[PDB]
Structure formats: C-alpha cells, structure tokens
C-alpha cells in the first residue's frame, strides 16, 4: 500500500478525536484535491496578508504556504479537542463542505501523490516535513504509520535533553541535504535547548528551468523603483515571446512564465505605477486571484524582469498564535495524544521553523549559465504589450494542474 493507491480505510483515524466541519469544475481534476487546494490557497493568501501587513514594504518575502499547510496537516494527525479544532480552522481545512478532520489526510494523500510521485527529473518537488521529538517521546504507531504513508514524514527522536546542539546541527544537516545545500540553517542559533520537546520543520525545494529562457547578453543594469521613493541598480533581464497574460483591474499586469515541464509556472503580479503593491496585497483574495488566472491568454509581448535571490527564514509560532493556533503551543492546553512520554506532564509543540529559497536568473530557478539566444526570421507586431517589472511585484510559483500555490512572495527590492 502506497500513497498513490491509498483508500480512506487505509488511513484510519482513531476517533475520540474527530472534527466535524460545518456545512456551507475543471475536467481531469480530482474534486478531492481540488477542494483541498482551495482551502490551502485560502490559508495562503490569509497568512500572506498577515505577514506583509506586519512587514516593511521594501523587504522581500518568500515562503511555501503549501509546505506550511502540509507540515501542520501531518502534525494534526496526533491532535485532539480544541488543539485539533484550532488546526482545522486556522489552516482553513474546515472550509471544505462538511469534511471530518480524518478525511483531510485522505485528500492530502491524493494531493501529495501527484506532487511528488507524478513527475519528471525536470520539475520535481522535494518535500521536507519532519517532527523532531526528544528521545523520551514515543509516537503512537498509528501516528508514525500515517505520517509515513501520507506525508512521507518521519517522527524523528533526537536527544534534546543532553545533546541539544548536536541535534540542531543534525536537523540543519537533514534540511540542507533536502535543499541540495541551498537552505543550511532552518533552525537559528540557540533555539533548541535541554528544554526543547517538539520541533516542527518543513520546506519545499524546487529548481526548474524556464521553458523560455532569457539571454545573459540582453541583461543589463537598469533602475528599480522601490516603495520608499529611492531607486537602485538591478540586473534587468529581457526577452520577447509568447506568454499567458492579462491586464486586470486598475491596470495590474499579470504574467505567467512557465518552467520546463509545463506543470509548474511562475506568476508575476505587477500593479500600475500609480498604484501600490500594498494596496494590491490587501485586495488580493483567493477568488480575485483565481479570476485573474482565468483571464490569461497566450500573447506576444516584451518582458523586462530583474534577476533576484530571496532567502526567507520563519519562526512560525508567533504569527500562527496570533492567528488562532493557540493550544498547540501551550503546555497546559495542548492536546497531542499521539505523542506520549513516561510520566511526562504536558506534551506540546515548542516551535516550528520554515525556510524558503528563491533564486531567479536567465536560466530559471536554478544554477546560472552562459546560454545565449539566437532568433532568426522573426518579425513581431510593432504594437505588442510590454511588461517592465522595475517596481515591486508579487510572485507565485504554482502547480497548475493541481491549482496549488507552492510558493508565494514579493520582490520589493532585487538590488545588490
């Protein structure tokens, strides 16, 4: 039995802990994963607006909401009561008609099967979801079992009591090994001591080549206009080609740059000069975003986009708590009956860390090169649209066939 042939009866969820959610289209798409994707995207824009709302406009942003949602879905396998309910609400899993928390894990089996098991060497996604617990903790057999089968995640025991530092180092090495070395410190200096009990860790790694590359020879220093009025020198890339596009409400330009493989694409949201990216951020709702993607059409245009490298690390407890996820991080309120410790009073999640890495260049989301481009016998319409991103713009990396937002971000300053 594997994640791709799993049936609900293969993902048994011990009762006494089940959440009954309240009551409230495209062909070849699984209604199950389709509902789950809308729920995950609801958490995605919500978490994003909350984050950007507490940040300074001139700072970049990059996270993997899919990763966060998944890690926490896996963790909730051993949750119960209010803790279980809080997870269902904060992560929007309850916005799915009337599903039980136990069904959500079935929808993830379906979702995760396509994301990591259906592929190509080109556009593979690397999943890193792990719950680190001190050696004194024993995970329920059903808990380990299902976390393995559905999330390919291990509930890994580490000697936090007397070997805190060497464990943190082991955690950092495991992640680094999963991110091909790009992410080497998911766990910041001095965040794991002899008092650490449970640490949730998750990231998603993606490296892909543009289906339509830019040529380094056409890249050149150009001025980028930051939210603070000042401007800086950026490595602006350039090319002309056919891209799905659409100018939407109040002059916001939406552009989709696909990666080799077609399944995964980069979507860029760029407001008009007159409008602030901040305003577009407050207005971007799951439905507005979806409507925009539906308006896109192939088109020949000029594209000016800067190269950029974003590396964002997160300590999730603070924001998640401020969003309604309380019990999980509370020693008195936490109800994780999937985790047990010899006469140990209270079992709770000490903290959860997530790091994301985005590097964009002429080749795509991967290692740079010298690939030049030669285009012969081409004569394009003199009145074709131009897309010049020399001002802050949003960024989405999505798995189109699964309506999943893998990553989301903001380039408010690409300069060096």
Ligand X SMILES: *[C@@H]1O[C@H](CO)[C@@H](O[C@@H]2O[C@H](CO)[C@@H](O)[C@H](O)[C@H]2NC(C)=O)[C@H](O)[C@H]1NC(C)=O
Ligand Y SMILES: *[C@@H]1O[C@H](CO)[C@@H](O)[C@H](O)[C@H]1NC(C)=O
Applying CB under 6 A, which residues contact ligand Y?
16, 80-81, 126, 177-178, 335, 337
What mask, x for binding ligand X by CB under 6 A, covers residues 5 to 34?
---------x--------------------
Nearer to ligand Y, 177 or 386 (CB): 177
- Give whole-number Cα distances, 156 to 48, 130, 191, 197, 325, in Å: 30, 7, 18, 12, 23
Element (H, E) at 194: none
What's the CA gap between 131 and 330, in Å, rounded? 17
Q: Which is it for the CA torsion 85, 102, 335, 15, positive or negative?
A: positive
34 is in an annotated binding site: yes
32 is in an annotated binding site: no
What's the CA gap between 79 and 281, in Å, rounded? 33
How many beta carbons lie within 10 A of that of residue 213, not counting itself? 19
What mask, x for binding ligand X by CB under 6 A, covers residues 256 to 295?
----------------------------------------
What's the CA gap between 226 and 398, in Å, rounded? 26
What's the farthest any 2 CA atoms get from each other in the chain?
A: 77
Nearer to ligand Y, 69 or 85 (CB): 85
Please count the residues of this chain forming the interface with ligand X, following the rule CB under 6 A: 6
Q: Which residues pair with 357 in a beta bridge?
A: 311
The interface with ligand X within residues 108-147 (CB under 6 A) comprises: 138, 140-142
What's the CA gap between 257 and 267, in Å, rounded? 6
What mask, x for binding ligand X by CB under 6 A, covers residues 363 to 392?
------------------------------
Using only the alpha carbons of the chain, give its radius of gyration: 22
Nearer to ligand X, 141 or 342 (CB): 141
Least Å distance between CB 141 and ligand X? 6
> Is residue 85 within the footprint of ligand X (CB under 6 A)?
no
210 is in an annotated binding site: no
Q: Which residues pair with 198 in a beta bridge?
A: 133
Which partner from the list ligand Y, ligand X, none does 14 bind, CB cut-off 5 to 8 Å by kind?
ligand X
Least Å distance between CB 203 and ligand Y? 11
Contact at 8 Å (CB) between 380 and 300? yes
Nearer to ligand X, 140 or 403 (CB): 140
**Residue positions forming the annotated binding site:** 34, 114, 130
**Residue positions forming the annotated binding site for heparin:** 34, 114, 130
Q: Which residues bind ligand X (CB under 6 A)?
A: 14, 138, 140-142, 340
């Amino acid at each position: 039995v594997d994640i791709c042939t799993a049936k609900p009866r293969d993902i048994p969820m011990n009762p006494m802990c089940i959440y009954r959610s309240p009551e409230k289209i495209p062909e070849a798409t699984n209604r199950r994963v389709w509902e789950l994707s809308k729920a995950n995207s609801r958490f995605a824009t919500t978490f994003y607006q909350h984050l950007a709302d507490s940040k300074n406009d001139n700072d970049n942003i990059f996270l993997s909401p899919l990763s966060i949602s998944t890690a926490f879905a896996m963790t909730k396998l051993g949750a119960c009561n209010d803790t279980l309910q809080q997870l269902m609400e904060v992560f929007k899993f309850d916005t799915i008609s009337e599903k039980t928390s136990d069904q959500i894990h079935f929808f993830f089996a379906k979702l995760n099967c396509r994301l990591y098991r259906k592929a190509n060497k080109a556009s593979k996604l690397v999943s890193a979801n792990r719950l680190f617990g001190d050696k004194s903790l024993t995970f329920n057999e059903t808990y380990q079992d299902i976390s393995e089968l559905v999330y390919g995640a291990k509930l890994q025991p580490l000697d936090f009591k007397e070997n805190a530092e060497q464990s943190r180092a082991a955690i950092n090495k495991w992640v680094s090994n999963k991110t091909e070395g790009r992410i080497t410190d998911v766990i910041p200096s001095e965040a794991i001591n002899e008092l650490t009990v449970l640490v949730l860790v998750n990231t998603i790694y993606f490296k892909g080549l543009w289906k339509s590359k830019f040529s380094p020879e056409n890249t050149r220093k150009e001025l980028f206009y930051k939210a603070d009025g000042e401007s800086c020198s950026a490595s602006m890339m350039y090319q002309e080609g056919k891209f799905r596009y659409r100018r939407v409400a109040e002059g916001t330009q939406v552009l989709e740059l696909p990666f080799k493989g077609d399944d995964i694409t980069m979507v860029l949201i760029l407001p008009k000069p007159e409008k602030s990216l901040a305003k577009v951020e407050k207005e971007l709702t799951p439905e507005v975003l979806q409507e925009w993607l539906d308006e896109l059409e192939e088109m020949m245009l000029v594209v000016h986009m800067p190269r950029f490298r974003i590396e964002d690390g997160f300590s999730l407890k603070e924001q998640l708590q401020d969003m309604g996820l309380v019990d999980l991080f509370s020693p008195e309120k936490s109800k994780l009956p999937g985790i047990v410790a010899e006469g140990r009073d209270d079992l709770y999640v000490s903290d959860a860390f997530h790091k994301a890495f985005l590097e964009v260049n002429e080749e795509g989301s991967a290692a740079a090169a010298s690939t030049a481009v030669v285009i012969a016998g081409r004569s394009l319409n003199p009145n074709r649209v131009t897309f010049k991103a020399n001002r802050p713009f949003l960024v989405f990396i999505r798995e189109v066939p699964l309506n999943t937002i893998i990553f989301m971000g903001r380039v408010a300053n690409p300069c060096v």
